[PDB]
């Protein structure tokens, strides 16, 4: 059994040392539903996906099925896929439009708002329909995202987020119309530990800087030019959270990462024009350049991320210790000309889909990754995370935060020292912020 | 996507041979790895088009594709096909070196001409057998509709586009790295 | 761990809850094969399977393997699949006539009673052959049908049956000649927890009356008649055994499902003329008015499952806590004419295989209740098992027993009960009737 | 059923082509779920049948499949046929509603000609390839025996017999809510 | 082993016919377990070959397949075929006693003349389906590489030599008790 | 828990009992790969498999994926195929040549040492490189055969094999050239546990001279022939390893299988000639009459299987306890005729081969016994292990150790004590010999 000493010793900040284990034990995952994806804040995609009255999403909270859908009077609600009956799918579809929702099992009839509103011969049979609806979700919104969490006792979306938010702001707050999710979201299958991807957008730019996407830089890079004269990015900072184990890198003053991602359009788009003036205006508050930030990850723990500089967002549904579902969407400024749009549309596909030049690396090395945790002696050493040990600084006069450089792992370790404090800490009275 | 409107009076004997062939050379260019003869069948102004698929109740069934402007599995063009071809040669694209073991059963063919002289709208069916490094397997179905004209080539045709209909609305596979 | 008491916590009759970690925790399943599987009475076949000496049928009791065979006195004896030697399955087909059994690893020799009469080098290796025969399960027949049990100390198969018999007899007493299997055994596999199953046929005539099996109804009834003119039966009763967790439920008067599961043809042979007279003639000591009685489902506890007016039967194999093989067929009187031998065949076929209208489905329902399972909050709050909760007496003129309305929940409450009893009393001594 | 009598002399190329042809314009009705203009197809004396297969010693052979008077995965007239295109064409019909995905390839078609003009007995081989919902992926294999009519419609035959031989004896899938 | 050498002209309607024919009827002697028939096929000469596949990175891509002085799969003879012919379908062979029910997927025939009259080398594409016992199902891909000979038997082909290329590094199946 | 108690009570060799559990257990499986997997010398293959230097093969411990390779200075190095900055696999490919190992994630170099010698950006970011390399195995050589050892306190190769020695030199020391490996390495999927595998080849001749392979010998046998004029052999022994559980079996002077199996031209090369004169020569002293042997089967405990007539060699590569990957070759005298070289490759595929006539019957027989055991009452009763009981004698006058008939399982049950000593005892100072 883990013992919350147990749990401790899984995770070493100070040494930068992480045991194995915790990406393949049956035991700790089921932990993890409870203690982890039980209280946290998951995201569940965005306000676009049901502009209107009726329009439903059905996605996941860790492997708990969910409904989100929008209320008449505007609002957005989150109840379990989940008839208390018998445990039956209410809702059976992807996503559409409803005007109420029935269980095909026995016939429990329910509204928009999750409420159980008709019981099949309930006057024969039966009782309080009020108390018989599926589980409620609290639902907050950040600047178009939906986020989702069970707890009543976990802090409200913008303490959770904290001095993570100005880095979000940067996908999510260039313009006063905001940002919508272009049509579309792909879903596919890796087999290996959330962890593993969470940690990834989270703090590894370090990844991209060296030998992972050589090929998927090759793929992107005009025909004429070739690997030799493809640009290295090497200035850059990464971004710890204060709590949260949220983290966010990026690169300073070399496009050559993001032209060869998403072309010379967007590029211009995103640092040249009116419309990245706006942007760095409205940012003026947080004081970053936010005009000389050319390809950036982030992780918003546990299980969402996304790339502002590309605009792609994933959510990482866990799926036991050694699978996950990908389901990824991507954003665009609401007033973004057509032509750009096209452009964040085409190169989406072309990096960041399953088939993408860059994905294609990433789900390769995962998957053998997890498959040597199979072994009795791949689990019996610590994997090293001392990347960057002790070199971030909290007075950054450029970005906020405890920042330290590109290639590092500090945000990585705060990731994974908030995963123990999460699995190690019952009450949210020390817990919390 | 609705069911293929076949011709009335069928393809002859000796179309519909030609372009069966072409299929099974084109096949075979693929599970032999032969890339950059493959990309020399793609014309110019190829677009090659792979929607997403979707669970909706039949009352809602007109929404189980992806439109144009949404996103795609695959929504490419000759430069972006070109890009693609690079990292798949490459000896740094990781997820096709080791390369994986293919075989691509093409059946189902039928063919109905267009406006253009020597130009063909061809629907096929295929089962995609994927088997890479020591135990994966992942297995592709669906259909292709195609738009082929006559060129001066091996195979006979070159191909203007392409639009895959893949069996899955979750992809049971970690990635794409295959040519359909 | 699952202590007698925290196994009582698991279902509340009272109170009419259900904890869904019943139907998806490992560990309970292991613990179901020994205090469930291990010690009640499965059925295995008819006697029609059979008939001559040798002839043999391969089945399971559990995750167990079993060959059930025809003996030269005509008893029908049951054992292990498994050679005690090195664990090699001894009868290697489905069914067919055997005069030996050979084991094919090593070449121990058994006759048809299971003995161990030839080991292979004996005189030069060894020992008494009469000690290292496969285990031998207890045998017992009901009216045509046979079932086994493995416990020496449990109750004989009458005793075990209790006040269930009477409704057994609807399906099983209706002539002198008793009943015959049609050839064929339909089997297939769906991944939901065998639980599931067991009830809807124990207590769950609600999913007919509702949502379920409006499209199977629709396949059924003539093509000039659309849904809303068929009639909805409300009619009937509910029957909960007294000991065992057995149950029943049956519309009155009301034929209208039947008629258009079984069409008109097998509707006038169970309701109207002299077979359904001399049934009743037959079934007169129970009091039970049975031409009256218009579609039946049963579960004997914990897997045997049936359907007396349109005679489908089936067993429910375990295979985890998230599958299940049905392993399907269905009986005929042996003296009924050729003409309604044949309806029975043709609808127990469009309706209950695998392609069935109605069995199609019930397998939907159930494969997307135990997904929902995988779910940490899913499994959190307890299943409503509350209908008709106070509502059962037995003091009924008409039906003996435990007897409730149609629609209702009192003999699931008495089969998650007596799963309760089994689970947590590990001694016949306080558990038997 | 023992291995298919094809006649010594293969039928003519054009006789091939269309029932070719016909096989994969049927796979396309029920691949886009064009239920109606599939059943109509099915002749008013069809019999449509999928018999029980079983693990048998080879001494026993002869009992593998199950018989005229024996259960069976389906057993079909005209009338219960249509019975079960009113459900799967129904909104209240669960199995298929969301719709499931599936793709028929045929292939290895043998054409046998009969005593009756117009009317031949075809043998063809399939994978059934059937994706629903989420992650749920079932393959089936196996033959098909028809015997088919010549008539005036979309496709130029009409089916007035089918046996489906499944390479199954337990079904690895849930149900069959699926057409061969 | 490289892209199959395809001629520029294809070959004729009725040659293309007679092969595709002569394939659907082996699979079909395969499928219902008329081994005797189906080794009578096996000319004098006959070899009958599955090289080993291994995972190799591109620069090392020569290596992919074991050769003629390497282990394989299969490497068989005449007088070897015929034991397994023996014991295939021997009352004591258990792998196949009860038997297995098999389903041979035959597309992509490719028809290449020789220097030796009525002689040719045909590529072909398969998919295995092999159902066996209770569940297991083992599923193979692949494409053989034949020389068939015309003969005067009742499927009017005879096989010379066959080289099966498994789409398959480590094998899934516990056994290979089937034929390719 | 699973104390050593508890699994003292697994295994009684004194009566001849399993407990079929051993097979079965996931708990045990876990301990396995610790106590057994995790200190025992295991086979990897042999040193014609790495020639020269740079040479790799990726291969198993286990299921601990490793690297075999050939060093400049002649030696052999076995290294842990993982990475130790986030677990990713750092030789890709099965085989070939490297000049170094690069990991395709971050790009940490390796040379073919596994010596960690490049980290990118270490100067910038970071530590020693001489700490953080993949784990190291022992490695030591017995006549061509390369086995490996992660457990440092563990006795050597020598000591570990002790009086097995000389029957493996029947196959490996015929002549002063030694053995070479026939290129190419078959690997395929079994689903049982590797007990039955390794058990099999150690002390089960018996299925063979029974049951299992009437088929194999009728496929081997002359076209003329039939099995009942082929002979049945019976004559010859089986030994017990003094300490490590390693076993062997052999046919004496009846070389009825050996001919049905190799044909006649190995057979000949085995038992006359001056190759087999040579042979008698060479192994004399060990008191050993080798042209005496003809076929024989041998496990090296836990996992090393071979046919020493035959040349047959393979490992058992557990994959839980319901699953095996075997991974096969076959070894020739280097000095072989070209003729007997070709004999001994085409009949290795011809019988021993995924799709081999001897090969085929194996894994059919093992799949229905992991299969079986999934039942409770399949687990409830011990297996006989009793064959032989008492008559192994160490005086033999024709063979060395403790020796018994053929047809016997003194060697299984010393196979099965050892197994139960390395899971009960965590020191070598009470298990070494
Ligand atoms: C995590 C961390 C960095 C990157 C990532 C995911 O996707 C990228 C695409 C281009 C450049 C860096 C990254
Ligand atoms: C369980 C409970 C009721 C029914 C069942 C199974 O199958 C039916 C078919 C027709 C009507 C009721 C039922
Ligand atoms: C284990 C034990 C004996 C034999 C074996 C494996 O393969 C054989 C092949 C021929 C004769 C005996 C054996
Ligand atoms: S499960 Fe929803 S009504 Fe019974
Ligand atoms: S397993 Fe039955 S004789 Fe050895
Ligand atoms: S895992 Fe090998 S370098 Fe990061
Ligand atoms: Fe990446
Ligand atoms: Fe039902
Ligand atoms: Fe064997």
């Given at each position: 059994?883990?013992?919350?000493?147990?749990?401790?010793?899984?995770?070493?900040?100070?040494?930068?040392?992480?045991?194995?284990?915790?990406?393949?034990?049956?035991?700790?995952?089921?932990?993890?539903?409870?203690?982890?994806?039980?209280?946290?804040?998951?995201?569940?995609?965005?306000?676009?996906?049901?502009?209107?009255?009726?329009?439903?999403?059905?996605?996941?909270?860790?492997?708990?099925?969910?409904?989100?859908?929008?209320?008449?009077?505007?609002?957005?609600?989150?109840?379990?896929?989940?008839?208390?009956?018998?445990?039956?799918?209410?809702?059976?579809?992807?996503?559409?439009?409803?005007?109420?929702?029935?269980?095909?099992?026995?016939?429990?009839?329910?509204?928009?708002?999750?409420?159980?509103?008709?019981?099949?011969?309930?006057?024969?049979?039966?009782?309080?329909?009020?108390?018989?609806?599926?589980?409620?979700?609290?639902?907050?919104?950040?600047?178009?995202?939906?986020?989702?969490?069970?707890?009543?006792?976990?802090?409200?979306?913008?303490?959770?987020?904290?001095?993570?938010?100005?880095?979000?702001?940067?996908?999510?707050?260039?313009?006063?119309?905001?940002?919508?999710?272009?049509?579309?979201?792909?879903?596919?299958?890796?087999?290996?530990?959330?962890?593993?991807?969470?940690?990834?957008?989270?703090?590894?730019?370090?990844?991209?800087?060296?030998?992972?996407?050589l090929s998927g830089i090759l793929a992107g890079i005009?025909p004429?030019?070739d690997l030799?004269?493809?640009?290295?990015?090497?200035?850059?900072?990464?971004?710890?959270?204060?709590?949260?184990?949220?983290?966010?890198?990026?690169?300073?003053?070399?496009?050559?990462?993001?032209?060869?991602?998403?072309?010379?359009?967007?590029?211009?788009?995103?640092?040249?024009?009116?419309?990245?003036?706006?942007?760095?205006?409205?940012?003026?508050?947080?004081?970053?350049?936010?005009?000389?930030?050319?390809?950036?990850?982030?992780?918003?723990?546990?299980?969402?991320?996304?790339?502002?500089?590309?605009?792609?967002?994933?959510?990482?549904?866990?799926?036991?210790?050694?699978?996950?579902?990908?389901?990824?969407?991507?954003?665009?400024?609401?007033?973004?000309?057509?032509?750009?749009?096209?452009?964040?549309?085409?190169?989406?596909?072309r990096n960041?889909?399953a088939g993408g030049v860059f994905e294609q690396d990433?789900?390769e090395?995962?998957?053998?990754?997890?498959?040597?945790?199979?072994?009795?002696?791949?689990?019996?050493?610590?994997?090293?995370?001392?990347?960057?040990?002790?070199?971030?600084?909290?007075?950054?006069?450029?970005?906020?935060?405890?920042?330290?450089?590109?290639?590092?792992?500090?945000?990585?370790?705060?990731?994974?020292?908030?995963?123990?404090?999460?699995?190690?800490?019952?009450?949210?009275?020390?817990?919390?912020? | 996507?609705?069911?293929?409107?076949?011709?009335?009076?069928?393809?002859?004997?000796?179309?519909?041979?030609?372009?069966?062939?072409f299929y099974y050379r084109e096949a075979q260019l693929l599970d032999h790895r032969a890339y950059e003869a493959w990309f020399a069948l793609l014309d110019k102004?190829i677009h090659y088009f792979m929607?997403?698929?979707?669970?909706?109740?039949?009352?809602?069934?007109?929404?189980?594709?992806?439109?144009?402007?949404?996103?795609?599995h695959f929504?490419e063009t000759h430069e972006t096909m070109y890009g693609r071809i690079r990292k798949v040669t490459s000896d740094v694209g990781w997820a096709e070196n080791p390369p994986s073991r293919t075989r691509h059963?093409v059946?189902?063919?039928?063919?109905?001409?267009?406006?253009?002289?020597?130009?063909?709208?061809?629907?096929?069916?295929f089962?995609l057998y994927r088997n890479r490094?020591?135990?994966?397997?992942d297995?592709f179905?669906?259909?292709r509709?195609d738009?082929?004209?006559?060129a001066?080539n091996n195979l006979?045709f070159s191909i203007a586009?392409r639009?895959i209909?893949?069996?899955?609305?979750?992809?049971?596979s970690?990635n794409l790295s295959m040519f359909f």
């Amino acid at each position: 059994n883990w013992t919350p000493e147990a749990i401790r010793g899984l995770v070493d900040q100070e040494k930068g040392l992480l045991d194995p284990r915790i990406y393949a034990d049956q035991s700790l995952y089921e932990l993890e539903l409870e203690r982890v994806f039980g209280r946290s804040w998951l995201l569940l995609g965005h306000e676009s996906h049901v502009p209107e009255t009726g329009d439903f999403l059905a996605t996941y909270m860790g492997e708990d099925p969910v409904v989100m859908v929008r209320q008449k009077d505007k609002s957005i609600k989150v109840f379990l896929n989940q008839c208390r009956h018998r445990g039956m799918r209410i809702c059976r579809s992807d996503a559409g439009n409803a005007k109420a929702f029935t269980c095909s099992y026995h016939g429990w009839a329910y509204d928009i708002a999750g409420k159980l509103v008709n019981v099949p011969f309930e006057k024969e049979a039966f009782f309080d329909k009020a108390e018989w609806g599926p589980l409620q979700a609290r639902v907050a919104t950040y600047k178009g995202l939906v986020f989702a969490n069970w707890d009543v006792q976990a802090p409200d979306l913008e303490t959770y987020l904290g001095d993570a938010r100005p880095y979000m702001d940067v996908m999510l707050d260039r313009t006063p119309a905001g940002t919508v999710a272009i049509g579309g979201m792909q879903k596919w299958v890796i087999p290996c530990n959330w962890k593993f991807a969470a940690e990834q957008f989270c703090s590894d730019m370090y990844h991209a800087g060296t030998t992972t996407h050589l090929s998927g830089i090759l793929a992107g890079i005009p025909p004429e030019m070739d690997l030799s004269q493809a640009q290295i990015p090497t200035k850059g900072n990464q971004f710890r959270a204060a709590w949260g184990g949220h983290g966010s890198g990026w690169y300073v003053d070399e496009p050559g990462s993001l032209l060869a991602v998403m072309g010379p359009k967007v590029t211009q788009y995103w640092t040249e024009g009116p419309a990245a003036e706006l942007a760095e205006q409205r940012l003026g508050h947080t004081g970053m350049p936010v005009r000389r930030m050319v390809g950036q990850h982030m992780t918003i723990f546990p299980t969402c991320s996304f790339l502002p500089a590309m605009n792609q967002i994933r959510v990482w549904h866990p799926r036991g210790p050694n699978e996950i579902e990908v389901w990824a969407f991507t954003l665009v400024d609401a007033d973004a000309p057509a032509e750009i749009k096209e452009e964040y549309r085409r190169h989406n596909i072309r990096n960041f889909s399953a088939g993408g030049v860059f994905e294609q690396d990433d789900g390769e090395n995962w998957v053998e990754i997890q498959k040597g945790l199979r072994g009795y002696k791949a689990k019996s050493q610590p994997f090293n995370a001392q990347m960057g040990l002790g070199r971030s600084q909290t007075g950054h006069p450029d970005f906020p935060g405890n920042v330290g450089y590109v290639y590092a792992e500090e945000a990585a370790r705060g990731m994974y020292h908030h995963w123990m404090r999460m699995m190690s800490e019952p009450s949210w009275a020390t817990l919390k912020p | 996507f609705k069911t293929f409107e076949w011709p009335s009076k069928a393809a002859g004997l000796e179309l519909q041979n030609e372009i069966e062939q072409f299929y099974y050379r084109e096949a075979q260019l693929l599970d032999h790895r032969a890339y950059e003869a493959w990309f020399a069948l793609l014309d110019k102004d190829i677009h090659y088009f792979m929607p997403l698929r979707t669970n909706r109740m039949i009352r809602e069934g007109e929404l189980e594709y992806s439109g144009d402007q949404d996103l795609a599995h695959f929504d490419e063009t000759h430069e972006t096909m070109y890009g693609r071809i690079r990292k798949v040669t490459s000896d740094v694209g990781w997820a096709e070196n080791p390369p994986s073991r293919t075989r691509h059963l093409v059946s189902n063919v039928i063919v109905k001409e267009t406006a253009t002289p020597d130009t063909f709208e061809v629907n096929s069916a295929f089962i995609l057998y994927r088997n890479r490094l020591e135990r994966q397997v992942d297995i592709f179905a669906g259909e292709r509709r195609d738009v082929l004209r006559r060129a001066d080539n091996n195979l006979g045709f070159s191909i203007a586009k392409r639009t895959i209909l893949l069996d899955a609305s979750t992809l049971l596979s970690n990635n794409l790295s295959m040519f359909f």
